[PDB]
Design a protein around this ligand. Structure first.
Ligand SMILES: O=c1cc(CSCc2ccc(Cl)cc2)[nH]c(=S)[nH]1
Length: 133
Protein backbone atom coordinates (compact mmCIF):
# COMPACT_ATOMS: atom_id res chain seq x y z
CA UNK A 1 0.00 0.00 0.00
CA UNK A 2 3.17 2.25 -0.09
CA UNK A 3 2.27 4.20 -3.09
CA UNK A 4 -1.51 3.82 -3.13
CA UNK A 5 -2.24 7.50 -3.43
CA UNK A 6 0.05 7.77 -6.49
CA UNK A 7 -1.59 4.95 -8.44
CA UNK A 8 -3.69 5.94 -11.42
CA UNK A 9 -3.75 7.95 -14.62
CA UNK A 10 -2.79 11.58 -14.37
CA UNK A 11 -2.82 14.41 -16.96
CA UNK A 12 -0.50 17.45 -17.02
CA UNK A 13 -2.36 20.64 -16.33
CA UNK A 14 0.34 23.24 -15.63
CA UNK A 15 4.05 23.70 -15.94
CA UNK A 16 6.40 26.38 -14.72
CA UNK A 17 10.05 26.99 -15.59
CA UNK A 18 10.37 23.71 -17.55
CA UNK A 19 12.35 25.31 -20.40
CA UNK A 20 14.93 26.60 -17.91
CA UNK A 21 15.10 23.18 -16.22
CA UNK A 22 15.67 21.51 -19.61
CA UNK A 23 18.37 24.07 -20.45
CA UNK A 24 20.13 23.38 -17.16
CA UNK A 25 20.00 19.62 -17.93
CA UNK A 26 21.54 20.21 -21.37
CA UNK A 27 18.54 19.62 -23.62
CA UNK A 28 19.00 21.14 -27.07
CA UNK A 29 16.80 23.72 -28.73
CA UNK A 30 14.59 21.55 -30.91
CA UNK A 31 13.91 18.98 -28.23
CA UNK A 32 13.09 21.72 -25.72
CA UNK A 33 10.55 23.25 -28.07
CA UNK A 34 8.75 20.02 -28.90
CA UNK A 35 8.99 18.58 -25.39
CA UNK A 36 7.74 21.80 -23.89
CA UNK A 37 4.55 21.57 -25.94
CA UNK A 38 3.66 18.10 -24.72
CA UNK A 39 0.78 17.45 -22.30
CA UNK A 40 1.70 13.99 -21.08
CA UNK A 41 -0.33 11.51 -19.19
CA UNK A 42 1.54 9.86 -16.33
CA UNK A 43 0.31 6.32 -15.52
CA UNK A 44 1.50 4.90 -12.18
CA UNK A 45 0.89 1.33 -11.06
CA UNK A 46 2.20 -1.04 -8.45
CA UNK A 47 2.44 -4.85 -8.52
CA UNK A 48 4.10 -6.23 -5.40
CA UNK A 49 7.37 -4.39 -4.89
CA UNK A 50 7.57 -3.22 -8.49
CA UNK A 51 6.42 0.33 -9.30
CA UNK A 52 5.82 1.29 -12.95
CA UNK A 53 5.67 4.90 -14.15
CA UNK A 54 4.67 5.45 -17.78
CA UNK A 55 4.62 8.82 -19.57
CA UNK A 56 2.63 9.05 -22.72
CA UNK A 57 2.64 12.08 -24.96
CA UNK A 58 2.80 13.23 -28.47
CA UNK A 59 6.56 13.81 -27.91
CA UNK A 60 7.78 10.49 -26.50
CA UNK A 61 6.36 7.59 -24.65
CA UNK A 62 8.56 6.42 -21.74
CA UNK A 63 8.26 3.67 -19.14
CA UNK A 64 10.25 2.77 -16.06
CA UNK A 65 9.76 -0.11 -13.64
CA UNK A 66 11.74 -0.27 -10.44
CA UNK A 67 12.04 -1.35 -6.84
CA UNK A 68 12.55 1.38 -4.25
CA UNK A 69 16.22 1.85 -3.35
CA UNK A 70 17.48 -0.32 -6.23
CA UNK A 71 19.42 1.40 -9.00
CA UNK A 72 18.37 0.92 -12.63
CA UNK A 73 19.65 2.35 -15.95
CA UNK A 74 16.90 4.63 -17.67
CA UNK A 75 16.78 6.29 -21.10
CA UNK A 76 15.16 9.65 -20.60
CA UNK A 77 12.77 11.30 -22.99
CA UNK A 78 15.64 13.59 -24.15
CA UNK A 79 17.80 10.52 -24.76
CA UNK A 80 20.16 10.70 -21.79
CA UNK A 81 21.38 7.33 -20.59
CA UNK A 82 21.20 7.69 -16.85
CA UNK A 83 21.53 5.62 -13.70
CA UNK A 84 18.42 6.16 -11.54
CA UNK A 85 17.49 5.40 -7.96
CA UNK A 86 14.02 6.08 -6.58
CA UNK A 87 13.19 6.09 -2.88
CA UNK A 88 10.22 7.08 -0.75
CA UNK A 89 11.10 9.90 1.74
CA UNK A 90 8.37 10.94 4.00
CA UNK A 91 5.68 10.04 1.53
CA UNK A 92 7.49 11.74 -1.46
CA UNK A 93 8.92 9.69 -4.34
CA UNK A 94 12.48 10.97 -4.80
CA UNK A 95 14.08 10.06 -8.17
CA UNK A 96 17.77 10.78 -8.66
CA UNK A 97 19.33 10.49 -12.13
CA UNK A 98 23.11 10.38 -12.61
CA UNK A 99 24.94 10.72 -15.93
CA UNK A 100 28.23 12.16 -17.17
CA UNK A 101 29.15 13.38 -13.68
CA UNK A 102 25.87 15.30 -13.44
CA UNK A 103 22.75 14.73 -11.30
CA UNK A 104 19.11 15.81 -11.28
CA UNK A 105 16.36 15.06 -8.80
CA UNK A 106 12.66 14.65 -9.59
CA UNK A 107 10.21 14.61 -6.66
CA UNK A 108 6.63 13.39 -7.04
CA UNK A 109 4.14 14.12 -4.26
CA UNK A 110 0.43 14.12 -3.65
CA UNK A 111 -1.00 17.54 -2.72
CA UNK A 112 -4.77 17.77 -2.39
CA UNK A 113 -6.19 16.09 -5.54
CA UNK A 114 -3.00 16.82 -7.52
CA UNK A 115 0.21 15.04 -8.18
CA UNK A 116 2.99 17.62 -8.13
CA UNK A 117 6.30 16.92 -9.91
CA UNK A 118 9.30 19.08 -8.97
CA UNK A 119 12.36 18.78 -11.21
CA UNK A 120 15.60 20.27 -9.90
CA UNK A 121 18.94 20.72 -11.69
CA UNK A 122 21.41 22.74 -9.52
CA UNK A 123 19.69 26.11 -8.77
CA UNK A 124 16.82 25.59 -11.25
CA UNK A 125 13.43 24.11 -10.31
CA UNK A 126 10.44 23.34 -12.50
CA UNK A 127 7.03 22.50 -11.10
CA UNK A 128 4.61 20.36 -13.13
CA UNK A 129 1.08 19.79 -11.84
CA UNK A 130 -0.99 16.78 -12.77
CA UNK A 131 -4.68 16.02 -12.10
CA UNK A 132 -6.56 12.73 -12.37
CA UNK A 133 -7.39 11.90 -15.92
O1 LIG B 1 7.23 11.50 -15.09
C1 LIG B 1 7.66 12.73 -15.31
C2 LIG B 1 9.06 13.18 -15.20
C3 LIG B 1 9.45 14.51 -15.33
C4 LIG B 1 10.91 14.68 -15.25
S1 LIG B 1 11.55 15.56 -16.65
C5 LIG B 1 11.15 14.46 -17.97
C6 LIG B 1 11.62 14.95 -19.28
C7 LIG B 1 12.95 15.15 -19.49
C8 LIG B 1 13.37 15.69 -20.67
C9 LIG B 1 12.48 16.08 -21.65
CL1 LIG B 1 13.05 16.69 -23.13
C10 LIG B 1 11.15 15.96 -21.41
C11 LIG B 1 10.74 15.37 -20.26
N1 LIG B 1 8.54 15.53 -15.64
C12 LIG B 1 7.26 15.11 -15.76
S2 LIG B 1 6.23 16.03 -16.03
N2 LIG B 1 6.86 13.83 -15.62
Amino acid sequence: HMCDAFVGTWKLVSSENFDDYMKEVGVGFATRKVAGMAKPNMIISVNGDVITIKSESTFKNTEISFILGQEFDEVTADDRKVKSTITLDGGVLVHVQKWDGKSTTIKRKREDDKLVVECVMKGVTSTRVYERA
